[PDB]
């Protein structure tokens, strides 16, 4: 599919005619450029909106100090609730509330800690309840790990790839803002299960928690173009080393 598009032009009364030919390879490339810029802008906008909305809530102090404290019961709940609502609106822009019954539990002890899924639910022992590991959330915010950006990429070809090299009060650190994406993703994952069980029974919910695998069926006729935070999809690691 190299498609050296081929063209000709004629004088009326067909005295004589001229030929030219051309190549999409510039046009598709510019299309890709525009696409990625567009979607990047959209995502950035979304994040900004989220951050500002949280900012509204009159926090006395920078985020991390909150969870570094453990005496709170209001702020943390508020945070969680806000994130959940944001996600739900991201899928149902017309929808605004969950009809009460939402309640939270702080968890503080390893002897209450649970691997993987850090936020957990009992949809109705009479009513919904949730559980959260603040200690772990601090561990996930073991912020020290962060560092300046690496610039790696793979499958290069030439400036066929590189052509973008020629294609044209909380005033606070980008990296600390970036930490928010962590909780975003976490609550997103949780919202998956919450939605699943809210739609269906408990045992399949347990099965999904056993393996986040069988989801791929039921999570269908479900994303009616409501894109979610998996843009740069090359999520992969060394495989052959599993060695059973």
């Amino acid at each position: 599919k190299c498609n050296k598009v081929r063209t000709v032009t004629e004088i009326v009364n067909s005295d004589e005619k001229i030929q030219k030919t051309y190549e999409l390879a510039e046009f598709d490339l510019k299309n890709l450029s525009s696409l990625e810029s567009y979607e990047t802008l959209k995502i950035k906008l979304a994040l900004s909106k989220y951050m500002a909305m949280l900012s509204t809530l009159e926090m006395t102090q920078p985020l991390l100090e909150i969870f570094r404290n453990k005496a709170d019961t209001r702020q943390i709940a508020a945070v969680v609730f806000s994130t959940l609502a944001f996600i739900h609106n991201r899928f149902h822009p017309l929808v605004t509330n969950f009809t009460n019954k939402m309640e939270f539990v702080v968890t503080e002890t390893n002897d209450t800690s649970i691997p993987g899924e850090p936020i957990l639910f009992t949809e109705n022992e009479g009513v919904l309840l949730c559980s959260v590991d603040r200690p772990s959330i601090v561990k996930m915010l073991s912020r020290e790990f962060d560092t300046e950006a690496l610039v790696n990429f793979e499958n290069d070809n030439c400036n066929v790839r590189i052509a973008k090299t020629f294609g044209a009060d909380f005033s606070i650190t980008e990296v600390e803002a970036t930490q928010y994406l962590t909780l975003l993703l976490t609550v997103e994952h949780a919202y998956l299960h919450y939605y699943i069980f809210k739609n269906y029974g408990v045992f399949e919910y347990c099965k999904s928690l056993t393996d986040h695998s069988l989801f791929t069926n039921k999570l269908r006729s479900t994303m009616s173009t409501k894109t979610s935070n998996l843009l740069l999809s090359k999520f992969k690691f060394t495989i052959e080393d599993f060695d059973k």
């Binding site: 994040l47 500002a52 993987g116 559980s131 790990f145 962060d146 980008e174 970036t178 894109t227």
Partner: protein, 231 residues
Amino acid sequence: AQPSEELINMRRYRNAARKLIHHYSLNSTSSTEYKISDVVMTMIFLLRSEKYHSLFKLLETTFDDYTCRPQMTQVQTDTLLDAVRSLLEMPSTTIDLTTVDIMRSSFARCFNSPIMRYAKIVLLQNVALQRDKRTTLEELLIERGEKIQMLQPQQYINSGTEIPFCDDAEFLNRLLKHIDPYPLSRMYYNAANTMFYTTMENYAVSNCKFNIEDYNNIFKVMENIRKHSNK
């Protein structure tokens, strides 16, 4: 005498050893982490303060190679933990025995094979977890859920319903402008891997090896999304 070579690039020795230790315990960030000369420099750099020599002694214990866990000289262990915090120069960020044990296991694999090419492989497992009994997730599911149901909410937080928002669009745009310069694409992946590490960071306890295939399913979430796009 010439005291140079022992510490001349104290800067190199300190910065690289600390970088390496953060790579292990703090799992900090991707790097071409290696220099066996630096590995030796770790020991030589340890050999010039008692607040090193203690840790050096502990680490030397690994050269016995047996997986036994050393006795806690409680007082001295605690003073040693504080010295570790100091020599790691961290904001007292909850450096703990568990991470110390993780480092012990790290060296329990580091020297233990002369793999003179490249064991470029995660060694997720630790022998020195609280037991090698290696019970599975499923029983702990019950063990946790019991007390979970037994507990009472710390606050009964909901009545009625509300939504938060604000519309200082100019303010939002100001923010946006402030926000622009940052390479999101790169900046986020490290945090994503932090979330990844978090699983292991949780189960230091009768751990269940399997994570990989369900992670692959997490990744094929995007696969399913594409499939939905295409029906």
